[PDB]
Design a protein around this ligand. Structure first.
Ligand code: SF4
Ligand code: SF4
Ligand code: SF4
Ligand code: SF4
Ligand code: FES
Ligand SMILES: [Mg+2]
Ligand SMILES: [Zn+2]
Lengths: 125, 690, 86, 157, 208, 115, 48, 106, 96
């Protein structure tokens, strides 16, 4: 009733992806960096998996931008790093994974601005 | 421990005493709305948007500035806090101009998003709004002060982070304005960062004005290469064209800011570009050909000569992949004349010991020092983020700074020990009182720049600095793994080249003039055609037409740092890889690919075919290059120091003058900067002001 | 047939590199006295076998393992490499 | 009932044999009852606004957008990013003229739907065509297809 | 709650909660969870092996008798170990009610076909196999229903590109319609519309 | 552990047997398809193409993947039997109209940036 | 328009044109932006 | 009425277009005004839903009342900024009349 | 103010004109290049500068709801004239 086979999962031959889009691509698993123009941090909660950038050229007519690769606009969202890594291995894509960066705790004191002797004294407010 | 228990919406959490309500809310997992609070800046309390209700307290407290005490239950989603937020947004938007369609911060405005999430949906303001005249603070920051919300964030950044007191608030009441009160240009190496911190479209990027919208752009996380700091950046592109560069958070290298040269010199990527191979014709002029022709000529010339007759020079913007590929190619022809533009004293340990040419204490470890000694360096213009870190430690850790060199302005007060290099020996001798004042220092630190090494006294100056560090270690004892000795670099490609066995300096070329010279992006002007034999063969392989292009015989177009996945090692020894944002224009190709194709044409086929194989070769040559966030390394100060005591070169009576004397010299440093219109505008504005 | 440079890859915290480390900390400087022109690069590995790479003329390279080698063993194979005997 | 249907009176034609003729008669009677409901709707038209007075969901008027700051911000954000729908999955079905037309919508909390499955009655009707055309002439298949009221836009999606 | 807020019905909520508890009591072997939404929609999460029993119960019990199968669909969530989520929507005419049954599966694990329970499921099941690649065992005939003949891949998966991998055109040299690797004159512009400053605190997740 | 539910085959032997039966069916059907669709290729070319498509998936070592591929192949063969396809669908297997992409390093270096 | 003419503006066409498809006056689309990347111009003086 | 184009390159119409038929590129003009350098509408991709004309905050892009504009070739249905400006100058009379008649319902 | 290219074509208001070597010029042979004759910059440069006696002036483009969003312009700077962000009209205080 149960095979109880011991082997890694591989569904490469069932997805129908062309061979040149499997052994040549290089996916990236990362937590997207916070947009420095904004102080919101709601876009740095989940893990993102995205493919590498390929060639884009100018259209001879009308000057539009043309891309010859299908996977360019693809992006996937994963709850944790392990799930994304498992997905990448299961689909047979070579991956580069980067550890999530979290800002370190910083101690902020209102009292420091009006310091008697330390250099943290503010010139104006 | 000393942690105290505080409740957020009834959920308990441990917080260290002195933690504000806002930080506790972040610890639980919620972000309090904010306009004036920045973690890297001093607390202000102006915008009053962070007003939150404490249970059983009739008054609403400001979460950013109120320290929390044991037992408090913070009701963030209570009715009172919501009403306070709505009122604050209504007051903020009462006088805001209806400039959203024309504002450069349309889809990335904190005002817009926070009004959508926490504010109301209509206005009862039936009066006329105010309007203030625009200010002019230079050609980098476009200023529209009608949109200012008077959060005094730029003022705090300029006063503390940049150390420049040009900005301030003039006036009282509703008509209080933010500006300089006079026609003055806010000029600094970190001037552009005020664009990012400003929540509204009051301060925007002038070169980027009216160009794109945030939702259109695609973000590529990459590494800056204009200096040796290696600050992380986000290249923002749109339809295969680089739109802008933004800083990326990294608490150990650049925090969240980038220098002006990093931020605004991407424009040079669109000018003077090398797009096709070029060869010399019958008349001696440069004409376009195909890859096959140029590769065939170069391979024939490489096959004809052999040994010391071939040579290569590495530029300041070359990646490790190209460096190792060229090293392999010239080794297959039995050559070792591999040189870089910047010189490093090879006497003694030289480049065999890695800790002999790195910033051992690291930028993050700067904050733990109590004294610092700068020798012949101008960190403000050579490594602006390093200088910013020094300034932050000086402001917060009460660090003591001393400089040996010209009395440059470092945006903080330091002790000017002198100008002559002889003072170094004095510090080594023990007559100078600074030796005594640094003897008691628990975590001393000595920094020596490559500018002081470019002169003929590199060996002697390095030996004197190592002697000073030895005196520190022997007298005060080994404090631990503190790694007193440091060296600060200027070009991004220096450390990667040194780790690969490249011979620093161009002296080898002068001693043995080659018959065919490889210019791997060498635009420093160190070697001209006068100090080379007649009918010499010059191959230039770069991305910009600069001082090294017209003297070449065959030109191979390379790729810029935004057009390839390449490895760069910063001044701390940390290796980081960039990502492909756009593809090289025209017929330009990747550098290591060009080297491999040339090798295969010449018959000396290289083992690697793909990028992964080249990186495996890099791992074989050096283990450290493959690691992409590791900075720790072994401390071999004793061996290098003992090997450095053999030769006894003397110091000359010339004062240590860095090349970066004034801000006008900081803008144009490499090929990309010299091709940027924005940098030319900055230089013109600095030279003469209006 | 002419040696051009040598590289020593050692792991900072692994015990298999332990003796190799001692080698440097005892005698590398003396070795640099005997060869003022030969470049002996020293690099750190990570969970990898300690190795010694020797490059000869025209790009030929040979690698030898250094796991669990004592200081005497590593200095012996080093003198074997520079002396040219195999 | 979903909108104002529980406030309008109309009759529901019911067949007796299940053949094509009964369904044709049912469609004609449904046309007549639709006329009845149209008359009722015309007679009982109330005054007021036409969209929900929530500028975070419905865009404001052009005059408000061109005179008010909050209105301009909300117009910008609604026409560039859209409104965020709270996470959840729903199946909403109505009595479309071809039968029960449904949408299963799954939202992850963003401004873009995570999943939108469309249930069209034509799919099930064409699936049952094979059963309904057992032991009939070739010319009867056209009549059965016509009485199924099949439009392939909803069938294929 | 002003006229801009959707009114809330509590009687239907209580009835659906009671029926969910009743169903979960009757079939404790298969049901893993029961939920009632804020807008009065009852859903039941069951084990994959309970597709045939539970459905049959909901179709035949005198108190449930969910006669009609309104819809059957699949949802792809790549972050889950069990990738695909199968959704059954049932309508009971006798009690004028609706129910939802949810099941999980992956690429290689088959799910027993419910053609015997509901005939209407037949084409629906084929559609799933056409769009997601979920195999249904003991199906009368399982094949593609929507995609072109010879189409490689399942389009509705989240890792399938929007424009596919091949495009069709007409070639005069071979005098027929041929398929080529896809090349777009204008690339589909990707917009980063999602914004910071979360909007719904009621759905906030623990910071793990 | 790693216990999984089967599809058709309990081990690799049954999957290999099913692969063999599918190959027998395709080999038998190739000439009928060639005659009926009025292809320009010969029976030898069609059988060679069938062999190539079978050997393309020769590295699969999972019985579930193998018998899922067998199910897909059976579905495609059934599609071919009932003339549900046309000449174009059959001839898409040969890429007679696509230019031959090169393999060596130098050609790929010359054509473009594609690795 | 005889009873109440449309408002007069300086930029409004004074001569209406019918559909000009299949005519030497037909509209031909083209790119409106300028060149993006400027290439290096080699010097005209020989190096030796 | 002064003669300056209403478009200010806010790119709202491009962002709201369901069919992605609008392409906009902009840069500061000679006098510093915020203006477009490229404004293309692909008439073979447009679905004529009217979202562009209702998302515009300055009534710059409008969906005119002309419907007899068939073409003999595919290329001439790819409008650029010049063609759209010509259409505006050509139809401004009745376009403005319709806008005046209907703007109280918007 | 429509200019003419050195080759012979008309230059668009965005400054676009194919140079001598561009092959894409062939798309215009036996046809015409669509160019708008009325340039917005020239038409707006000839508008008179309005003279108002208030520090802050309001502009909505004329027509009320048919114009652009209402904005306020400050005229304290006597060196130059305040310019509307949307419409491009100019305003100035009564100097002397
Ligand atoms: S600062 Fe923000 S709210 Fe103000 S006009 Fe600009 S985008 Fe709109
Ligand atoms: S200019 Fe920007 S950062 Fe400075 S006070 Fe005004 S809103 Fe704050
Ligand atoms: S009418 Fe056409 S151009 Fe305008 S938004 Fe709709 S699809 Fe886009
Ligand atoms: S046409 Fe209107 S909506 Fe589109 S970019 Fe121009 S001003 Fe904005
Ligand atoms: S964020 Fe605390 S008062 Fe502004
Ligand atoms: Mg800003
Ligand atoms: Zn105006």
């Amino acid at each position: 009733q149960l095979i109880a086979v011991d082997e890694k999962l591989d569904i490469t031959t069932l997805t129908g992806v062309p061979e040149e889009h499997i052994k040549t691509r290089k996916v990236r698993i990362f937590v997207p960096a916070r947009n420095n123009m904004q102080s919101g941090v709601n876009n740095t909660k989940k893990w993102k998996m995205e493919f590498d950038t390929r060639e884009r050229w100018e259209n001879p007519l009308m000057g539009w931008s043309s891309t010859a690769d299908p996977l360019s606009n693809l992006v996937l969202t994963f709850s944790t790093k392990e799930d994304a890594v498992a997905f990448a291995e299961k689909n047979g894509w070579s991956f580069d994974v980067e550890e999530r960066k979290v800002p370190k705790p910083k101690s902020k004191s209102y009292g420091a601005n009006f310091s008697w002797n330390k250099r943290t004294r503010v010139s104006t407010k | 421990s000393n942690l105290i228990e505080v409740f957020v919406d009834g959920q308990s959490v441990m917080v260290e005493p002195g933690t504000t309500v806002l930080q506790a809310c972040e610890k639980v997992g919620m972000q309090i709305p904010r306009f004036c609070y920045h973690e890297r800046l001093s607390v202000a309390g102006n915008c009053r948007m962070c007003l939150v209700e404490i249970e059983k307290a009739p008054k609403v407290v400001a979460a950013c500035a109120m320290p929390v005490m044991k037992g408090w239950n913070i009701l963030t989603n209570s009715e009172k806090s919501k009403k306070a937020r709505e009122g604050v947004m209504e007051f903020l938007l009462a006088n805001h101009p209806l400039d959203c369609p024309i504002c450069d911060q349309g889809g990335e405005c904190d005002l817009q998003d926070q009004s959508m999430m926490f504010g109301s949906d209509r206005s009862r303001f039936l009066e006329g709004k105010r309007a203030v005249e625009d200010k002019n603070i230079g050609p980098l920051v476009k200023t529209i002060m009608t949109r200012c919300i008077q959060c005094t964030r730029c003022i705090r950044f300029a006063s503390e982070i940049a150390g420049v007191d040009d900005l301030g608030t003039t006036g009282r009441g509703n008509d209080m304005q933010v500006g300089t009160y006079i026609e003055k240009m806010f000029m600094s190496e970190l001037s552009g960062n005020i664009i990012d911190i400003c929540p509204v479209g009051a301060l925007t990027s002038k070169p980027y004005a009216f160009t794109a919208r945030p939702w259109e752009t695609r973000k590529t996380e990459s590494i800056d290469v204009m200096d040796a700091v290696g600050s992380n950046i986000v290249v923002s592109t749109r339809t295969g064209e680089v739109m802008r560069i933004l800083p990326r958070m990294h608490e150990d290298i650049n925090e969240e800011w980038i220098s002006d040269k990093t931020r605004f010199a991407y424009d040079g990527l669109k000018r003077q570009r090398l797009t096709q191979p070029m060869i010399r014709n019958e008349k001696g002029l440069l004409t376009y050909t195909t890859w096959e022709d140029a590769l065939s000529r170069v391979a024939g010339m490489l096959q004809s000569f052999q040994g010391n007759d071939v040579a290569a020079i590495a530029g300041g913007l070359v990646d490790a992949e190209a460096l190792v590929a060229l090293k392999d190619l010239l080794n297959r022809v039995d050559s070792d004349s591999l040189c870089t533009e910047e010189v490093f004293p090879t006497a003694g340990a030289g480049t065999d010991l890695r800790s002999n040419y790195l910033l051992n204490t690291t930028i993050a470890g700067v904050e733990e020092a109590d004294v610092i000694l700068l020798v012949g360096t101008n960190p403000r213009f050579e490594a602006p983020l390093f200088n910013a870190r020094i300034r932050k430690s000086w402001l917060h850790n009460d660090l003591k700074v001393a400089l040996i060199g010209s009395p440059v302005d470092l945006t903080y007060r330091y002790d000017h020990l002198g100008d002559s290099p002889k003072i170094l020996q004095d510090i080594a001798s023990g007559n100078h009182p600074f030796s005594q004042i640094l003897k008691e220092a628990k975590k001393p630190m000595v920094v020596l720049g490559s500018s002081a090494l470019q002169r003929s006294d590199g060996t002697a100056i390095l030996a004197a600095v190592s002697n000073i560090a030895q005196n520190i270690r022997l007298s005060s004892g080994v404090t631990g793994d503190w790694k007193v000795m440091n060296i600060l670099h200027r070009i991004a490609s220096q450390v990667a080249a040194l780790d690969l066995g490249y011979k620093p300096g161009v002296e080898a070329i002068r001693k043995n003039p080659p018959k065919v010279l490889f210019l791997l992006g060498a635009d420093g002007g160190c070697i001209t055609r006068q100090d080379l034999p007649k009918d010499c063969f010059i191959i230039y392989q770069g991305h910009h037409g600069d001082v090294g292009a017209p003297m070449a015989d065959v030109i191979l177009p390379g790729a810029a740092y935004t057009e390839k996945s390449a490895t760069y090692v910063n001044t701390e020894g940390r290796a980081q890889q960039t990502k492909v944002a756009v593809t090289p224009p025209g017929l330009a190709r990747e550098d290591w690919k060009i080297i491999r194709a040339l090798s295969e044409i010449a018959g000396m086929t290289l083992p690697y075919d793909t990028l992964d194989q080249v990186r495996s070769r890099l791992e074989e040559v050096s283990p450290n290059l493959v690691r992409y966030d590791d900075v720790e390394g072994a401390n071999y100060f004793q061996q290098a120091n003992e090997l450095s005591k053999l030769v006894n070169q003397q110091l000359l009576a010339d004062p240590l003058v860095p090349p970066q004397l004034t801000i006008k010299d900081f803008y144009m440093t490499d090929s990309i900067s010299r091709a940027s219109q924005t940098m030319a505008k900055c230089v013109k504005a600095v030279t003469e002001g209006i | 047939l002419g040696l051009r440079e040598i590289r020593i890859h050692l792991c900072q915290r692994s015990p298999g590199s332990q003796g190799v480390r001692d080698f440097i900390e005892k005698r590398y400087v003396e070795l640099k006295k005997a060869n003022p022109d030969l470049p002996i690069l020293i690099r750190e590995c990570s969970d990898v076998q300690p190795k010694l790479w020797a490059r000869y003329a025209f790009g030929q390279e040979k690698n030898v393992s250094l796991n669990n080698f004592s200081a005497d063993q590593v200095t012996r194979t080093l003198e074997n490499v520079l002396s040219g005997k195999a | 009932p979903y909108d104002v249907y529980d406030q309008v009176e109309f009759d529901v034609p019911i067949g007796s044999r299940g053949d094509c003729y009964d369904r044709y008669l049912c469609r004609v009677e449904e046309m007549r009852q639709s006329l009845r409901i149209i008359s009722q709707c015309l007679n009982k038209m109330p005054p007021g606004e036409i969209k929900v007075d929530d500028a975070k969901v419905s865009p404001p008027k052009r005059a408000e957008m061109k005179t008010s700051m909050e209105s301009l911000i909300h117009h910008f954000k609604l026409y560039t990013e859209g409104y965020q729908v709270p996470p959840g999955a729903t199946y909403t079905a109505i009595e479309a003229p071809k039968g029960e037309f449904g949408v299963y919508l799954v939202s992850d909390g963003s401004s873009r739907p995570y999943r939108c499955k469309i249930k069209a009655p034509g799919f099930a009707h064409l699936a049952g065509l094979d059963k309904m055309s057992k032991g009939h002439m070739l010319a009867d298949v056209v009549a059965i297809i016509g009485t199924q009221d099949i439009v392939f836009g909803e069938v294929d999606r | 709650t002003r006229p801009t807020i959707r009114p809330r019905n509590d009687v239907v909520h209580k009835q659906l909660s009671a029926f969910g508890q009743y169903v979960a009591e009757i079939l404790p072997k298969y049901v893993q969870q029961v939920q009632v939404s804020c807008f009065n929609e009852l859903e039941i999460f069951i084990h994959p092996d309970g597709v045939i029993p539970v459905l049959t119960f909901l179709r035949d019990h005198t108190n449930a008798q969910f006669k009609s199968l309104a819809d059957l669909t699949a949802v792809d969530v790549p972050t889950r170990q069990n990738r695909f989520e199968i959704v059954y929507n049932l309508l009971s005419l006798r009690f004028n009610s609706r129910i939802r049954v949810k099941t999980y599966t992956d690429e290689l694990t088959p799910i027993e076909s419910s053609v015997t329970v509901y005939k209407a499921a037949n084409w629906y099941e084929r559609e799933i196999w056409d769009m997601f690649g979920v195999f249904f065992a003991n199906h009368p005939d399982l094949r593609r229903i929507l995609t072109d003949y010879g189409f490689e891949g399942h389009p509705f998966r989240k890792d399938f590109p929007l424009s596919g991998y091949v495009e069709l055109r007409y070639d005069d040299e071979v005098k027929r319609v041929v398929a080529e690797p896809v090349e777009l004159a204008q690339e589909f512009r990707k917009f980063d519309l999602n914004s910071p400053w979360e909007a719904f605190p009621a759905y906030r997740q623990p910071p793990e | 552990g790693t216990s999984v539910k089967p599809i058709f085959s309990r081990d690799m032997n049954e999957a290999k047997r099913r692969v063999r039966e599918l190959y027998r069916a395709w080999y038998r059907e190739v000439p009928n398809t060639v005659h009926l669709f009025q292809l320009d290729i010969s029976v030898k070319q069609g059988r060679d193409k069938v062999r190539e498509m079978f050997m393309k998936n020769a590295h699969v070592t999972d019985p579930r993947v193998v018998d899922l591929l067998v199910i897909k192949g059976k579905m495609e063969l059934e599609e071919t039997i009932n003339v549900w396809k046309q000449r174009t669908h059959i001839m898409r297997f040969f890429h007679e109209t696509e230019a031959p992409r090169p393999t060596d390093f130098l050609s790929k270096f010359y054509v473009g940036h594609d690795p | 328009p005889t009873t109440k003419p449309p408002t007069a503006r300086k930029y409004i066409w004074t001569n209406h044109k019918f559909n000009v498809s299949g005519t030497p006056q037909q509209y031909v689309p083209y790119s409106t932006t300028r060149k993006k990347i400027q290439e290096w111009v080699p010097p005209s003086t020989p190096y030796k | 009425p002064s003669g300056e184009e209403r478009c200010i390159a806010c790119k709202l119409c491009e962002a709201v277009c369901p069919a992605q038929a609008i392409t906009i590129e902009a840069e500061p003009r000679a006098d510093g005004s915020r203006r477009t350098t490229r404004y293309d509408i692909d008439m073979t991709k447009c679905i004529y839903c009217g979202f562009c004309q209702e998302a515009c905050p300055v009534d710059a892009i409008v969906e005119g009342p002309n419907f007899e504009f068939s073409t003999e070739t595919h290329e001439e249905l790819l409008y650029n900024k010049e063609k759209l400006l010509n259409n505006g100058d050509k139809w401004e009379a009745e376009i403005a009349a319709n806008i005046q008649a209907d703007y109280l319902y918007r | 103010g429509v200019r003419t290219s050195p080759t012979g074509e008309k230059v668009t208001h965005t400054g676009q004109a194919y140079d001598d070597g561009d092959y894409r010029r062939v798309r215009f042979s036996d046809r015409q290049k669509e160019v708008n004759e009325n340039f917005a910059i020239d038409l707006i440069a000839e508008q008179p500068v309005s003279e108002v006696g208030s520090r802050v002036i309001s502009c909505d483009g004329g027509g009320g709801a048919l114009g652009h969003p209402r904005v306020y312009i400050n005229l304290d700077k006597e060196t130059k004239t305040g310019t509307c962000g949307y419409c491009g009209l100019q305003f100035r205080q009564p100097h002397h």
